[PDB]
Amino acid sequence: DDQVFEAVGTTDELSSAIGFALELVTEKGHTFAEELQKIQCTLQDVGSALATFKAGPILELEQWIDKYTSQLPPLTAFILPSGGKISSALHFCRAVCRRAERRVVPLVQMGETDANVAKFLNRLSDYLFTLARYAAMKEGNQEKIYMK
Amino acid sequence: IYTKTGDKGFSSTFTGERRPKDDQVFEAVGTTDELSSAIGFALELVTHTFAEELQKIQCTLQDVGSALATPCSSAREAHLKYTTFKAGPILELEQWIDKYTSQLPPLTAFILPSGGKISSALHFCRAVCRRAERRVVPLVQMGETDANVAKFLNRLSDYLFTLARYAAMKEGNQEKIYMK
Amino acid sequence: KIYTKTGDKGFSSTFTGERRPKDDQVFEAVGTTDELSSAIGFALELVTEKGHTFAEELQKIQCTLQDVGSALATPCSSAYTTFKAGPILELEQWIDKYTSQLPPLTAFILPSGGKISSALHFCRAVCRRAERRVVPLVQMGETDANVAKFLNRLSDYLFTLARYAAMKEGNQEKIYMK
Numbered sequence: 001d002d003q004v005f006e007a008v009g010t011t012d013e014l015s016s017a018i019g020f021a022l023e024l025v026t027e028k029g030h031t032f033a034e035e036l037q038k039i040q041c042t043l044q045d046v047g048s049a050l051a052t053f054k055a056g057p058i059l060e061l062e063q064w065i066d067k068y069t070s071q072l073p074p075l076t077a078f079i080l081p082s083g084g085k086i087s088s089a090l091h092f093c094r095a096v097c098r099r100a101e102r103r104v105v106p107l108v109q110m111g112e113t114d115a116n117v118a119k120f121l122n123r124l125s126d127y128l129f130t131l132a133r134y135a136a137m138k139e140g141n142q143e144k145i146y147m148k
Numbered sequence: 149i150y151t152k153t154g155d156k157g158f159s160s161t162f163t164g165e166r167r168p169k170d171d172q173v174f175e176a177v178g179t180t181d182e183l184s185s186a187i188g189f190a191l192e193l194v195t196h197t198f199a200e201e202l203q204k205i206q207c208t209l210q211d212v213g214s215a216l217a218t219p220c221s222s223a224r225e226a227h228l229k230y231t232t233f234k235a236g237p238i239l240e241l242e243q244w245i246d247k248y249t250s251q252l253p254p255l256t257a258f259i260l261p262s263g264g265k266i267s268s269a270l271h272f273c274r275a276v277c278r279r280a281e282r283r284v285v286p287l288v289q290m291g292e293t294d295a296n297v298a299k300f301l302n303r304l305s306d307y308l309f310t311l312a313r314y315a316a317m318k319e320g321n322q323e324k325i326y327m328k
Numbered sequence: 329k330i331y332t333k334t335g336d337k338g339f340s341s342t343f344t345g346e347r348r349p350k351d352d353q354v355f356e357a358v359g360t361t362d363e364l365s366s367a368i369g370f371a372l373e374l375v376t377e378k379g380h381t382f383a384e385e386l387q388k389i390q391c392t393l394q395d396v397g398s399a400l401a402t403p404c405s406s407a408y409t410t411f412k413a414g415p416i417l418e419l420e421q422w423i424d425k426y427t428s429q430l431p432p433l434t435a436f437i438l439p440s441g442g443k444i445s446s447a448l449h450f451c452r453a454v455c456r457r458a459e460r461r462v463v464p465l466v467q468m469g470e471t472d473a474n475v476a477k478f479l480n481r482l483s484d485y486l487f488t489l490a491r492y493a494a495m496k497e498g499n500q501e502k503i504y505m506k
């Protein structure tokens with residue numbers, strides 16, 4: 001099936017975009033770098049699952065999200081993809097992650113893939129978005145804002 | 149785990165339709181966000197008027213996104229500002245291109261993606277932009293999206309191409325030329 | 329003036345002169361191929377030192393990617409378009425060169441290994457996307473099988489070159505962990 005190869009490929013594409021973003025991290029021992037690396041592993045499991053996906057990593061993502069949200073101001077503006085190297089790269093990862101989601105979706109719904117793979121990808125773009133903001137905040141960057 | 153509205157693989161348009169995330173509309177808005185993000189990263193390599201231009205373009209790509217997520221077949225009276233995509237930013241890209249073009253050597257051979265970090269990031273952006281044009285086109289040719297969105301993305305890749313060239317020249321980088 | 333506006337309505341030309349909508353699978357394959365060449369272009373900028381022979385290789389590969397573009401823009405039924413085996417066989421030689429210098433590998437390598445190596449894993453993914461786009465074209469007999477072969481062998485090249493970059497830099501690449 002072509003749809004499976006497409007979904008696996010786009011998952012790998014995401015993981016490799018994360019791989020490149022990780023290279024932008026200049027200081028050693030950041031916990032989000034650990035997290036991104038764990039996600040990459042999960043993406044490999046996504047890969048073979050597509051080709052039973054437990055809920056744990058979704059929960060993991062949800063607690064990391066909540067951790068970073070509580071450290072950040074409320075979200076009042078619409079931001080443009082920005083805020084420093086890592087941040088921008090994560091915004092790109094977010095876009096690619098959302099593309100992966102769209103590719104997995106028909107596979108679920110056809111019941112060829114565990115529902116949770118979609119949920120994980122859905123939640124991953126929230127993680128990547130949140131992490132981007134968190135990363136920019138910690139560089140004290142200030143992201144660019146929408147203007148007509 | 150949370151029960152998020154997107155978890156069963158459906159999302160919403162700005163007109164209230166529920167569609168599988170699979171849908172053309174989301175392929176089209178996703179790919180546009182992808183493009184804007186790529187530009188976001190390219191901006192981070194600015195080492196500048198053209199940096200200002202790239203941001204305005206990101207802002208237009210927001211509008212593009214609002215437009216794509218508002219199918220004309222179901223736009224009502226209050227959504228008219230989203231369904232209406234004015235020509236202005238296109239004329240802008242055109243006059244920007246003329247400006248840069250009048251500062252560049254004449255062009256006759258095929259340029260490979262190259263020219264320094266900013267220039268190469270821009271060539272990648274251009275490629276992503278043309279993918280975004282491919283996603284928008286079927287919405288336009290189905291009457292769901294203003295044709296001006298497509299004009300824009302069409303022109304944008306020529307803008308992004310000529311800026312790449314400009315950046316290369318202002319760094320003293322010669323781009324590679326197609327060989328054989 | 330570089331823009332004609334003639335594609336402003338969503339249509340464009342194949343190298344046969346046929347007008348098609350821009351979302352036609354021919355354009356999807358050509359574009360994805362451009363995307364790949366652009367990704368290689370960026371990875372090329374991550375090379376610090378002068379005179380790396382792989383850097384010369386990737387640039388030759390960009391040239392072939394243009395040829396792959398043209399071939400794809402010239403679908404066979406509507407025409408006469410053959411893609412020669414040469415750049416494939418050449419890729420195969422370069423692959424052996426790097427492959428033979430590498431540790432035997434039993435792990436699963438996560439996209440990692442430094443900037444170059446990382447950029448090249450991404451390139452590999454985009455190349456694999458380009459393969460997936462070329463596949464329908466070959467199966468309906470619009471494109472020479474060799475074109476798919478080239479991108480396939482190029483996926484292999486980019487993976488193993490990323491391993492090579494990582495090893496030269498002495499940059500440990502990350503492994504799959506359960």
Ligand SMILES: Nc1ncnc2c1ncn2[C@@H]1O[C@H](COP(=O)(O)OP(=O)(O)OP(=O)(O)O)[C@@H](O)[C@H]1O
Nearest residue numbers: 098101102152153154155158159160169174177178
């Ligand atoms: N995978 C996707 N690709 C492109 N666009 C999307 C995708 N998912 C959602 N969208 C669009 O972007 C908007 C914001 O995305 P969001 O992720 O918040 O929606 P969702 O996935 O339906 O909701 P939730 O993430 O809260 O479950 C959505 O209303 C939808 O129009």
Ligand SMILES: Nc1ncnc2c1ncn2[C@@H]1O[C@H](COP(=O)(O)OP(=O)(O)OP(=O)(O)O)[C@@H](O)[C@H]1O
Nearest residue numbers: 278281282331332333334335336340341342355359
């Ligand atoms: N968005 C696209 N994605 C992939 N391939 C394209 C795209 N647009 C055009 N092509 C192909 O690449 C060639 C050069 O593209 P170009 O953008 O100059 O064409 P166009 O959009 O038809 O014309 P113009 O841009 O001058 O209005 C075209 O002749 C066509 O074969």
Ligand SMILES: [Cl-]
Nearest residue numbers: 010099279457
């Ligand atoms: Cl795609």
Ligand SMILES: [Mg+2]
Nearest residue numbers: 122123125154
């Ligand atoms: Mg979502």
Ligand SMILES: [Mg+2]
Nearest residue numbers: 125126129154
């Ligand atoms: Mg949301």
Ligand SMILES: [Mg+2]
Nearest residue numbers: 302303305335
């Ligand atoms: Mg064009």
Ligand SMILES: [Mg+2]
Nearest residue numbers: 306330331332
């Ligand atoms: Mg042109």
